[PDB]
């Protein structure tokens with residue numbers, strides 16, 4: 646089963662802005678070093694390995710972000726954003742990580758800015 650979280654649906658954020666996305670809806674853009682977004686109430690119904698996909702774009706090299714649960718109580722890992730050659734040239738990167746069942750605040754934190762994100766998809 647899959648859960649799709651629209652990236653623009655965050656409850657809290659720092660130093661980002663929403664913009665119309667070429668794939669419909671909105672994406673988060675104007676992401677800098679130290680920008681972040683937080684999504685409450687993300688349910689992982691079983692304990693085990695999940696695929697977490699990120700629909701991202703960048704016209705530059707080096708965009709990088711970390712994902713975490715509960716404000717860094719559990720770090721899930723870090724994602725590099727490819728240089729897809731345009732701000733609306735989208736691609737899907739992923740991480741495979743182990744989470745125990747629960748409902749968590751899910752956080753994305755920009756280590757190196759210059760990347761956009763459309764959505765997050767979680768699959769077990």
Ligand SMILES: NCc1ccccn1
Nearest residue numbers: 681683716752753754
């Ligand atoms: N965990 C992403 C984040 C960072 C700072 C504050 C809230 N959430």
Ligand SMILES: NCc1ccccn1
Nearest residue numbers: 675676677758759760
């Ligand atoms: N050059 C646009 C931009 C601004 C802030 C963050 C990332 N890209």
Ligand SMILES: [Mg+2]
Nearest residue numbers: 651652671763
């Ligand atoms: Mg979106």
